[PDB]
Amino acid sequence: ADNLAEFHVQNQECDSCHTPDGELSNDSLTYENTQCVSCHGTLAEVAETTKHEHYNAHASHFPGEVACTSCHSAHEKSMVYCDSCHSFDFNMPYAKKWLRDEPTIAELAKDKSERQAALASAPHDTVDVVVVGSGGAGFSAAISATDSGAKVILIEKEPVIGGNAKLAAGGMNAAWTDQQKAKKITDSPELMFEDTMKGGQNINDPALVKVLSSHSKDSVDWMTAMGADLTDVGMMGGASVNRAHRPTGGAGVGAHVVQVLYDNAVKRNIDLRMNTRGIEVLKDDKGTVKGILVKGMYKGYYWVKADAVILATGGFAKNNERVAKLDPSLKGFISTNQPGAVGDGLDVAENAGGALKDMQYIQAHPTLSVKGGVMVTEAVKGNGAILVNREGKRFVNEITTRDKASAAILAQTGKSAYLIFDDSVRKSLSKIDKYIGLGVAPTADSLVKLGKMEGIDGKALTETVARYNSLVSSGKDTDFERPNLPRALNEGNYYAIEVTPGVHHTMGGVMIDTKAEVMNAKKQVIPGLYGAGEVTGGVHGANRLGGNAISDIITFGRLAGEEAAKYS
Ligand SMILES: Cc1cc2nc3c(=O)[nH]c(=O)nc-3n(C[C@H](O)[C@H](O)[C@H](O)COP(=O)(O)OP(=O)(O)OC[C@H]3O[C@@H](n4cnc5c(N)ncnc54)[C@@H](O)[C@@H]3O)c2cc1C
Numbered sequence: 001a002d003n004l005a006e007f008h009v010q011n012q013e014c015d016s017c018h019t020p021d022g023e024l025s026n027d028s029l030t031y032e033n034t035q036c037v038s039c040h041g042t043l044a045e046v047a048e049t050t051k052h053e054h055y056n057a058h059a060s061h062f063p064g065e066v067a068c069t070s071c072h073s074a075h076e077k078s079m080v081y082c083d084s085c086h087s088f089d090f091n092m093p094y095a096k097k098w099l100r101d102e103p104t105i106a107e108l109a110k111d112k113s114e115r116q117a118a119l120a121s122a123p124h125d126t127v128d129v130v131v132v133g134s135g136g137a138g139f140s141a142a143i144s145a146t147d148s149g150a151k152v153i154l155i156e157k158e159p160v161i162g163g164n165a166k167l168a169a170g171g172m173n174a175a176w177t178d179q180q181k182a183k184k185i186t187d188s189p190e191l192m193f194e195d196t197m198k199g200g201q202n203i204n205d206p207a208l209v210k211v212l213s214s215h216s217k218d219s220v221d222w223m224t225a226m227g228a229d230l231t232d233v234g235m236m237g238g239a240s241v242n243r244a245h246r247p248t249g250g251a252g253v254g255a256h257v258v259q260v261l262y263d264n265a266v267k268r269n270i271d272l273r274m275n276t277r278g279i280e281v282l283k284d285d286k287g288t289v290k291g292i293l294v295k296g297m298y299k300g301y302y303w304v305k306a307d308a309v310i311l312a313t314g315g316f317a318k319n320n321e322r323v324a325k326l327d328p329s330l331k332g333f334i335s336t337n338q339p340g341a342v343g344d345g346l347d348v349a350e351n352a353g354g355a356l357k358d359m360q361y362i363q364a365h366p367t368l369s370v371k372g373g374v375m376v377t378e379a380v381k382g383n384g385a386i387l388v389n390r391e392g393k394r395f396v397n398e399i400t401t402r403d404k405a406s407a408a409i410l411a412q413t414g415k416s417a418y419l420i421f422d423d424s425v426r427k428s429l430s431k432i433d434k435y436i437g438l439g440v441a442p443t444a445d446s447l448v449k450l451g452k453m454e455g456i457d458g459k460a461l462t463e464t465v466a467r468y469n470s471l472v473s474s475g476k477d478t479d480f481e482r483p484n485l486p487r488a489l490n491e492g493n494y495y496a497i498e499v500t501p502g503v504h505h506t507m508g509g510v511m512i513d514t515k516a517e518v519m520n521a522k523k524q525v526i527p528g529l530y531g532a533g534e535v536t537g538g539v540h541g542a543n544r545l546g547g548n549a550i551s552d553i554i555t556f557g558r559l560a561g562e563e564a565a566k567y568s
């Protein structure tokens, strides 16, 4: 067989997969996926048959219910979604090599005939609010709009939910929470505001930062009430005290928060549509939102009539061509991002009259795994890891600004560095076990052996850790002025992770006000149009603090949904 359908039709009728009339049920292929499961079992049940020691195509860190058709097409060869960041040894029947070639919004102007036909038809749906993007901002808006009594459709262009938010590790910033208080942490929303303003070089819109800091506690409360565990409170660079909230034991905040939002959306019966890309915001003769043209992968173009459209589409950090035009120093870098994070929602915003701001400010995350090509959380350093160069020396305050950390690492022999840590750090942050499982954290019972394994000067490395640990006990880093020194590296075995900078976060995007209303270049509100999350600019200025994006998407997502529902 050349394809999966051909294989099945040897022994099966068409209607073993299809509805009676043969038409595709919807863009999520709900009915068709239900048929896969009726014969093969759920994803969890399939996973029992495809275990490898350290990975499993059918049991991943992805939240929600991942549809079979995300990777298995019927009538043509298909790609393994996991191939967009990893290179596991897979043998998926009817596989083809991972390639993402999604048309830009501009290229889709060539579908004029089909688009005109769609717009000439009745709206497929008439609702109050359409939310575009199933990341943290979009789920938060969809849920909060629904709880405010609005009828919502939530669309996602990808086959899977969650965007970049499902990848978040280090935490969700907030002050002054019950969770902090339970851990003996003293904080304030004012201190958070002041850290954030300082972190963004005072470029941030102060009114947006005040929403961020002042709503942050309520957003942790809101997530917790919906079932989230945010009780572990870690340290990340640029924060005056521990405020990065995440699940017990230091697990990843992202997959967890997105799973909770997913469960809560399903419980409220929110209409969520996969493989459904927002193309064009529709405006009436007076310039207010009247709906949105969408493109379903399977069902084609159609439009939804709505009073309000919330753009919650994330950043463009995966789009290196667009990144390099704005910041040439990032050209050719690998990204930490999901394959769809290319900025098409910004194109949709601009076409609707929205102005962009702060686009030139793009964050490189200092520590991508050289070996794995994936982000290594700053929480590894926050919890006590150091950085060494190949010479076996520290060379930077590990929790300095991300731009300076990145610059420092690129300045070292080989343009990479090593995270160095022990079992006490490892046990303090369960996320570290994920790096060990990936195979990117080689270990030894001494630093001489470890250095020899990795090409790091082993005597210098030994002496560097002895010297650092002395600095920890005395409570001051007279070498690089690291302001937080939580742990000596002296329990059990030692680990090295080779790391290098990658493109991570785009601080610019659509201008919003404190109501998440999108504004034009004249600073006039576009009535019915909203923006929330990494798609927006102004919140983070010139540099975002770690933990501040998950805070932003929940706060601004929730607020947009409430505002859009009241607008109505
Ligand atoms: C690996 C990684 C780890 C991170 N860790 C942290 C952390 O610990 N703490 C922190 O504060 N920040 C962290 N960040 C930053 C943060 O998770 C992102 O800023 C956040 O994901 C922004 O969420 P969002 O809802 O705006 O967008 P996303 O979560 O990116 O979701 C937007 C969604 O919209 C989509 N979409 C886009 N265009 C369209 C369209 N036209 N139609 C339909 N759908 C569309 C998607 O493809 C995507 O699923 C991390 C980012 C990455 C990449």
Ligand code: HEM
Pocket (backbone or CB within 6 Å): 004, 007, 008, 012, 016, 017, 032, 033, 035, 036, 037, 039, 040, 068, 069, 072, 074, 093
């Ligand atoms: C739904 C679209 C669906 C998918 C996806 C799916 C997957 C799948 C694969 C990857 C194979 C292996 C093919 C190969 O080895 O080349 C496979 C094989 C079998 N399937 Fe299937 N399957 C989907 C749908 C369905 C449905 C609706 C049925 C039955 C009504 C069905 C059953 C089977 C059977 C039997 C096989 C042969 C292997 C076996 O388990 O005995 N699948 N499928």
Ligand code: HEM
Pocket (backbone or CB within 6 Å): 004, 005, 008, 009, 012, 013, 014, 015, 016, 017, 018, 022, 023, 024, 029, 032, 069, 072, 073, 074, 075, 076, 298
């Ligand atoms: C039986 C021989 C059979 C026919 C006929 C058939 C038709 C068909 C069409 C025309 C489409 C495209 C429809 C559109 O674009 O609107 C389509 C798409 C999908 N199919 Fe199919 N199909 C037949 C058999 C099967 C079998 C046995 C399966 C499951 C193993 C299956 C499933 C799917 C799925 C999923 C799609 C969406 C696109 C894709 O994955 O290729 N069909 N089919």
Ligand code: HEM
Pocket (backbone or CB within 6 Å): 054, 055, 056, 057, 058, 059, 060, 061, 062, 081, 082, 083, 084, 085, 086, 167, 169, 252, 336, 337, 338, 339, 374, 375, 433, 434, 435, 437, 438
């Ligand atoms: C596709 C569904 C997919 C699978 C399967 C997968 C597996 C996987 C493993 C086995 C690890 C090691 C840790 C663990 O067992 O959970 C791991 C780690 C990371 N991944 Fe992954 N992964 C899949 C897909 C993707 C894609 C599409 C991305 C990027 C958009 C991605 C990213 C990451 C990152 C970052 C890590 C580091 C550990 C962590 O952050 O938890 N994965 N993945």
Ligand code: HEM
Pocket (backbone or CB within 6 Å): 036, 037, 040, 041, 042, 043, 046, 049, 050, 057, 058, 066, 067, 068, 069, 070, 071, 072, 080, 081, 082, 089, 090, 091, 092, 093
């Ligand atoms: C949906 C629940 C789903 C089903 C059903 C399904 C079926 C399936 C089968 C039957 C196989 C072959 C198992 C065997 O060894 O005989 C198989 C294999 C792979 N799949 Fe699958 N699959 C479902 C969903 C998904 C999704 C969502 C992904 C990608 C994220 C995916 C991918 C893969 C890969 C890769 C393989 C090969 C496994 C390996 O080589 O270890 N599937 N699937």
Ligand SMILES: O=C(O)/C=C/C(=O)O
Pocket (backbone or CB within 6 Å): 168, 169, 170, 171, 376, 377, 378, 379, 505, 545, 546, 547, 548, 549, 550
């Ligand atoms: O866990 C991290 O490193 C990411 C932090 C952030 O981007 O906010």
Ligand code: NA
Pocket (backbone or CB within 6 Å): 315, 506, 507, 508, 509, 533, 534, 535, 536, 537
């Ligand atoms: Na942004």
